[PDB]
Design a protein around this ligand. Sequence first.
Ligand SMILES: Nc1ncnc2c1ncn2[C@@H]1O[C@H](COP(=O)(O)OP(=O)(O)O)[C@@H](O)[C@H]1O
Ligand SMILES: Nc1ncnc2c1ncn2[C@@H]1O[C@H](COP(=O)(O)OP(=O)(O)O)[C@@H](O)[C@H]1O
Ligand SMILES: Nc1ncnc2c1ncn2[C@@H]1O[C@H](COP(=O)(O)OP(=O)(O)O)[C@@H](O)[C@H]1O
Ligand SMILES: [Mg+2]
Ligand SMILES: [Mg+2]
Ligand SMILES: [Mg+2]
Lengths: 172, 371, 371, 371
Amino acid sequence: PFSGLKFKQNSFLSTVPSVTNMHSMHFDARETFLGVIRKALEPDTSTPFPVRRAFDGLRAEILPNDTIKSAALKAQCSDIDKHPELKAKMETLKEVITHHPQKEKLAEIALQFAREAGLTRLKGETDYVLSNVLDGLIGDGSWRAGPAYESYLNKPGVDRVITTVDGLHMQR
Amino acid sequence: TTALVCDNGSGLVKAGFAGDDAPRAVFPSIVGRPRHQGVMVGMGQKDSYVGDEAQSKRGILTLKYPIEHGIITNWDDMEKIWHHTFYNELRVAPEEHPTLLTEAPLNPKANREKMTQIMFETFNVPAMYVAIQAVLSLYASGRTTGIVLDSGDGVTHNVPIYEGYALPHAIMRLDLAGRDLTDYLMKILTERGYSFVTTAEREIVRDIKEKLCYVALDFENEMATAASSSSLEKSYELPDGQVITIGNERFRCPETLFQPSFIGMESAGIHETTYNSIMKCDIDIRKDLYANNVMSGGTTMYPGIADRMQKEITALAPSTMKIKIIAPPERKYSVWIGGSILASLSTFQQMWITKQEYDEAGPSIVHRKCF
Amino acid sequence: TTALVCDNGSGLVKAGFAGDDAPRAVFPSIVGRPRHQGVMVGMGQKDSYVGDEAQSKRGILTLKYPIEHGIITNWDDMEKIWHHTFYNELRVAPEEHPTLLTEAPLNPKANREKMTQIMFETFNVPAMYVAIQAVLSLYASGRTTGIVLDSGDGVTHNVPIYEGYALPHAIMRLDLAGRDLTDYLMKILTERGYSFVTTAEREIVRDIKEKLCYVALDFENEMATAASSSSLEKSYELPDGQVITIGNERFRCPETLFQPSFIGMESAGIHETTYNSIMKCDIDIRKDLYANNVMSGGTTMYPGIADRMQKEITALAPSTMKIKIIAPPERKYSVWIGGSILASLSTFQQMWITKQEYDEAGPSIVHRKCF
Amino acid sequence: TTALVCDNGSGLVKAGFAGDDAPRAVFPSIVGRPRHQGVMVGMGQKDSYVGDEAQSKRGILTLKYPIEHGIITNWDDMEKIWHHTFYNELRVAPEEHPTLLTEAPLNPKANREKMTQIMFETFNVPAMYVAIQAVLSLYASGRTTGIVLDSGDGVTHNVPIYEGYALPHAIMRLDLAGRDLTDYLMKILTERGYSFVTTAEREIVRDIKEKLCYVALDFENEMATAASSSSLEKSYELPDGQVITIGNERFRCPETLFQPSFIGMESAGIHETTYNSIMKCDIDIRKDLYANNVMSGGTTMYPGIADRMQKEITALAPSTMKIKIIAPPERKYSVWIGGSILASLSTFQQMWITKQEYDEAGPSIVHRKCF
Ligand SMILES: Nc1ncnc2c1ncn2[C@@H]1O[C@H](COP(=O)(O)OP(=O)(O)O)[C@@H](O)[C@H]1O
Ligand SMILES: Nc1ncnc2c1ncn2[C@@H]1O[C@H](COP(=O)(O)OP(=O)(O)O)[C@@H](O)[C@H]1O
Ligand SMILES: Nc1ncnc2c1ncn2[C@@H]1O[C@H](COP(=O)(O)OP(=O)(O)O)[C@@H](O)[C@H]1O
Ligand SMILES: [Mg+2]
Ligand SMILES: [Mg+2]
Ligand SMILES: [Mg+2]
């Protein structure tokens, strides 16, 4: 139903934020990531008009831009088993996402969002609309585990390093 | 009821109520997202600054231009800008006021189709119309014959109009405008140790170009004078207190309008483009089109550009013909004034596009009803 | 429930409850152990003393600072001070009150990870959080923009913040603060025959520095004046009754803050660092940063230091800008005062690191929820 | 007579005779002066050290780089550097040999005029010529078509050349190179407790970066790999016998080349800069440019950076195009080898700027006869 959908190669590059802004105190990693995904799937002119419109309508229903629309969709998606039409629409979105020519860049951007801003901190309890999207970008499903951060308390190196500035004001 | 005119250009968004002499809201078409980390509670909670607040807080933002080279690219940013214009600057309800938008010639059809779809679906506008910018400019000039040179921040275009009959086969478009001049000035201020690489620095260099540059009558003669003495050099104060002085960059920056070879383009200068635009029309109207060079847009505001235009066209033109340049002082807003005129003429209210028509024909109606 | 704010400085420990105006308990951060053999049985002898009680018996003890240059070194001694802080100074149970801690920027990550483990397991606090000291200083000042210079006992650092957004690449740190000055004064006091070698006597010198030292507006002119007459000489009474008189040592000791080469450091003075920190920020925010220099910490309490900083920054900055130095009279507790405010924000209550979250993620969770 | 070639890079000086396959003298471009007070007579009698001598005695010197981002900022130190290169390293009289110098594109024009003046007055060279570094790098590859990514200590720039013709409007320059990476590594080394603040410690950090850093093909999987085990950790011995161990910092430091946002810069990575520079050329030469990426400079020999660059460009380019990266093992001296070749050509002996030609025209002559 979505054959021939061509996209701009670098449409979504201008949307991804800076790494320093990921650690902002008030930063919605979910909304920024969904905006990047929304930009990544914009139909171009080469796509025929009817399928273009149909995909635009589906994208508007599932991936809106207004905050109230996103909140309403998330709230109505908690009990998703009573909306089989949403299931079908999400599956259709997955099928076109999984064949995106820029899947690798999208997957690495998703991993960067997960590691820096903590896109998936619920580690398997993430929103349904995020679950299928991430499954499309990365099909292994390993994002349920987590970024696997690092630790320093295991003392792999006993340190005890005293450089020039630390050698002056040395205590004991 | 009262009509709305919203001249969406690449550089500045000019909007206001129709039937008025001058615009009411002029704000740059810039959308800004914070760049650095936010560390203090309560400060932040603003994903995107758009309009003038995107110019106040330039230190911490990345400024993106939604409407590059005339064609809208980032449609979400354009939607934000339109929402801002309708709900904050004009303070009007979009569903209770007819609107009017502008577009350059030779644009992709998909652009205006998506424009109409956004206007009729997201905003639920009652009626709308898309007009080519230079015809509006001619409306503002109070004339019925002439050739118009509109040069803004994105696109420089020409259309020769004779007795209300435009000649589509003579329309010329050239993607060389204000933003290219600003970038060229950026590349040339490095020759004095001044470096500008970020978007806020882009706005600063654009301000320098607006406030100090001028068009030299004889580029070769002016270049000798600048290299001979220091009368041409001026001083500008950067926002952080440093003082810069620029010399031959004052008139080498706007020269790219006449010699697009400076930025590597193979196309010819604007004067020769205007000359060619006339030679593609019928022989009996060339006399009138020489005598009605109307020019509009911000990029046309440089001091002396009218005289250089006149001299170049006279050099190209036959000796008998009279070359006259019409440069009204308010030409920075000629397009908006023409939109205001056209939205208030009685014979225009039958050339609207209505939601009832939209539903029957779809987004394809715009090419059939508009030019 | 009421939150606890405990600022573990290098020199002093400031503790209290959120919502109060001043810390309830301020005691020195030293742990002392006897260095002689007891002979008298039948009286209470303790192996260690913490805080003020250690000061009163410093004639028989060996004082050790469990924090140096901003990083905690002796964890067993550090644990004692917290236990003294929670039970003997505050008379509270840490299992009931959340705690907010402070830390200098650019400290090793192992330092703050241990602070999480020693509070979720040794004391079993409901939740905790770690904040940058420089930011807390800005909160107490009732601002949202400026450049903060906090200099305490161990670390002098700068953190420029614009509209609640920090610039981490512009953060500066120097290991030059009050403890280094006390060691410098203890060296040049050997010029007149005064010797101080024991840790007990270093406390005496630290008191001499507080009550007599000041920053001269001009170093050369002051040096000539003190070398000409005996106007600047002042007297101090040692605890054994002996009297000491000092002359030019009064303003030579705090001069190291502007000329670090006295103590062998290759780094530049604080005024150059503050200027160097500003120039790493964006061009459009330098005007605001010049007029919002905020100071805090004990090392800033010297008489005349605000004027000397005001004079020096002006010379390096351009003549157009205005330099304003902000030194509120209670800046010795600015970090803690901002700590009480921040813990009292209703919006801040979502940023705590709960006990449940720690058991899921481990000590490394402090690196994600804390800047 | 035999020509001289002297590549006064930002970090290292390369010198030698034309026609030789490798430089004869390679020493770091640093001038140091003592910072402690000498005490033994007859031993401290020098004022400043140049090159390797400054590196050997860096424990008691303050090392300063006379070049910052490809632009010379301390001209007396540069005079010392050139004097040393001519006399103590090459042991030739500059008054008997023509010299060839190198410069990055888009450099301030005053920088090369003063170079010409210093060469033609202080050293009295018979003739001299200034060449763009990136163009020379292409000579020492046996090709006349390709895009050159030269990245040294100060400046990373791109120069696209097709069939011997350069497209100057497509030249990209970026102030992000080896020195910035060393500074970033110094900043993040404090996370493990290692603090380096002095210039000698800056040299130590630079050596560590040279010896233990590598570019990860996939950043996020590499970060997980290093955080899950200890396979990537490596040990380095500080000169005083202490041992330091680094982890993810091995591939985090070179990552700033592809993500400049780590160090607060807004510009895009080197791969995006290469792609943008290629896309600004004519549509008929992109296919050849994709197949002839030439990489040269000291910052280019991170292990595996060629594969990462190829992967990124493959992601950015269309599928049907073939991306080939050319990274010969001798790319630390590609610029110098090309300079040796060019001065050795028989068709170049007519483009030297002779002494007589400089006297007639002045320092402005170097702008006309050089690109
Ligand atoms: N006084 C001036 N002198 C020179 N250039 C100007 C002046 N005012 C505006 N400009 C240039 O005009 C450009 C856009 O002006 P405008 O005509 O509003 O564009 P548009 O037609 O796209 O709305 C700006 O980029 C600016 O560089
Ligand atoms: N009135 C004063 N004049 C000069 N120095 C002072 C004064 N009061 C305190 N100090 C010094 O300030 C230093 C640090 O105090 P404080 O601000 O508590 O540091 P911290 O920020 O580490 O808690 C102390 O070592 C003390 O010597
Ligand atoms: N093997 C290496 N790995 C990583 N970086 C290196 C290596 N060798 C040299 N460098 C870095 O390359 C930088 C620039 O070297 P060079 O090419 O001589 O600069 P320039 O082009 O200015 O002469 C040096 O500062 C050094 O830190
Ligand atoms: Mg316009
Ligand atoms: Mg403190
Ligand atoms: Mg080089």
